[PDB]
Amino acid sequence: GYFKIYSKHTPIDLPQGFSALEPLVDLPIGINITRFQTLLAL
Amino acid sequence: SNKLDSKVSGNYNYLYRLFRKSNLKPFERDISTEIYQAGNKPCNGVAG
Ligand SMILES: *[C@@H]1O[C@H](CO)[C@@H](O)[C@H](O)[C@H]1NC(C)=O
């Protein structure tokens, strides 16, 4: 019932290398999730 | 809480669920008012 988001940023197909991810946000929402979609800035 | 959740004429505000397609998972809430599909014929969003 929690939403955990981990994020990482870097300067540059996916590149070859190792880069771990740090935790940023935990949202205690608890909603049944089945699908998702993204949004661009046209 | 019989002195606060009951009335002489009957308190119909509280409602519960009697029929569902599958058992609920732990820590889940369902507020869907869709008609239960007991038979093969669709309910068409109306009692019958
Ligand atoms: C979440 O929604 C999907 C959509 O069909 C459903 O199959 C699943 O049973 C739902 N799970 C819960 C826990 O509500």
Answer yes or no: is the C-beta of A34 below 6 A from any ligand 1 atom.
yes
End-to-end Cα, chain B, rounded Å: 35
Look up residue B46 and give its DSSP letter: S
Residue pair A19/A8 in contact by the 8 Å Cβ criterion = yes
Determine if residue A17 is left, alpha or beta; phi over 0 gives left, psi from -120 to 50 gives alpha, anything else beta.
left
Deposited experimental method: cryo-EM
Closest alpha carbon to B43 in B21, B23, B24: B21
What is the experimental resolution, given in Å to one decimal place?
2.8
- Give chain A's radius of gyration (CA, Å): 14
What number of other Cβ atoms are within 10 A of residue B30's Cβ? 9
- Nearest chain B Cα distance for residue A30, angstroms: 8
- Measured by CA distance, the residue closest to atom 6 of ligand 1 is A34
Chain centroid to CA B33: how far?
A: 7
Residue pair B36/B19 in contact by the 8 Å Cβ criterion = yes
